[PDB]
């Protein structure tokens, strides 16, 4: 389905109860320099299960509006997501701050964090892999990360990582760690967990690896572009790194680290979207991924999103660049209101009423 709207109450700078959205299939969040856009990113992360340690605060209660100046505005706060799916009633996922503790709710009924995470997983929202959300300044790292860290992401998404413990145990029992490892039974038991881990991992990796080239072609709009994912260890891919290499469109092969910030961004988005072909997320939240893109690549990314936002995924972007955000269907504009603490509020603007022409 799709993220229909966010409801926020007294969360960081979002004082009072505010409706964010409704979102269209392609919506941009914009506004002047301030804390409101980054706080909305944090609100989305919060309701989608982020740990307090990653929300720029020391304690959970510091997320309540007014805590930065020692005077919280309420004893409670929440962020709520309304999730919509054709042929089903709206489902509301909420995380409430009560008594300095987080309470999770689905359709206003309290659940434990485990069931909350489980229900989001069945919609394609993985709160550990977090492959649906890209933070400001982070998009290029998706293409540039250590290969071994890419393997970790594939082990989390594919659940092959759940087998790593039994794997390590059977490997040692087979003689790993001895000077000269030597048994038919232990060999078989290690070959069996090896195959199980291999099969889980490969179901994810082969899907992503076989779709990334077409996606990278579709983003840089060029047959000359090529993208390759390959394991350092083909017999046991989960043991070593997953290599990511691209041939920039119409350019000659350079080893990735020589690509421009813009080129790295496009390669990172291809990977992001290739992951989506294996375990699709209903929406992406992309924070300033256009920062290093020139106008040509901005056009190509927005075109890909637009043709994809017609019911493959929903795109919620935060952008500082009118070249990008004017290609969205609607705008959420964040603005400040004076107070003891700065207050953020929003406006909504429908761009589809105006011709994108002359």
């Amino acid at each position: 389905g799709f993220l229909k709207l966010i409801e926020i109450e007294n969360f960081k700078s979002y004082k009072g109860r505010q409706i964010i959205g409704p979102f269209q299939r392609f919506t941009a969040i914009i506004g002047p320099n301030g804390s409101g856009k980054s706080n909305l990113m944090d609100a989305i992360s919060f309701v989608l299960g982020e740990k307090t340690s990653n929300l720029r605060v020391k304690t959970l209660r510091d997320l309540i509006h007014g805590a930065p100046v020692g005077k919280p505005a309420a004893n409670r706060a929440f962020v709520s997501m309304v999730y919509s799916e054709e042929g089903a009633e709206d489902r509301t996922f909420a995380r409430v701050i009560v008594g300095g503790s987080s309470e999770y709710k689905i359709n206003n009924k309290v659940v434990q964090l485990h069931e909350y995470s489980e229900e989001l997983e069945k919609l394609g929202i993985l709160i550990k892999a977090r492959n649906f959300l890209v933070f400001q300044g982070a998009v290029e790292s998706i293409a540039m990360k250590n290969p071994k860290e890419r393997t970790a992401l594939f082990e989390e998404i594919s659940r092959s990582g759940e087998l790593a413990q039994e794997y390590d145990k059977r490997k040692k029992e087979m003689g790993s760690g001895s000077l000269v490892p030597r048994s038919g039974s232990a060999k078989q038991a290690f070959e069996q967990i090896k195959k199980e881990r291999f099969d889980r991992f490969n179901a994810c990796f082969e899907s992503v690896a076989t779709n990334i080239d077409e996606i990278y072609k579709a983003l840089s709009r060029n047959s000359s572009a090529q993208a390759f994912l390959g394991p350092e260890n083909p017999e046991e891919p989960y043991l070593d790194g997953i290599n990511y290499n691209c041939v920039a469109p119409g350019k000659r092969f350079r080893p990735m680290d020589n690509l421009s910030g813009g080129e790295k961004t496009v390669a990172a988005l291809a990977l992001l979207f290739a992951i989506h072909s294996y375990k699709p997320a209903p929406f992406f939240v992309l924070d300033q991924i256009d920062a290093a893109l020139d106008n040509t690549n901005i056009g190509k990314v927005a075109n890909y999103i637009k043709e994809q936002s017609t019911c493959n995924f929903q795109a919620i972007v935060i952008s500082l660049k009118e070249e990008f955000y004017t290609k969205a269907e609607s705008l959420i504009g964040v603005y400040p209101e004076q107070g003891d603490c700065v207050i953020s509020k929003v406006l909504t603007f429908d761009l589809t009423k105006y011709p994108d022409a002359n």
């Binding site: 002047p32 009118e322 004017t326 504009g333 406006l347 909504t348 761009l351 105006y354 011709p355 002359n358």
Partner: protein, 70 residues
Amino acid sequence: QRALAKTGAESISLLELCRNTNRKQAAAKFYSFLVLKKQQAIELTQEEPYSDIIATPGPRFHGSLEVLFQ
């Protein structure tokens, strides 16, 4: 003397401002409303999501408002 005669209205409708503009121009007017609000040159009201956005004078003076409401 020429400045005194540049009278204005009690409110400005964003949707009226954006009538017969293209998408980039309309977005820029929307964005200008956000900036003017940050500068406290205007107050903003929007009755419901995606309704008209109405600007009224804010608690700070601001120059060149006949440019921004054109």
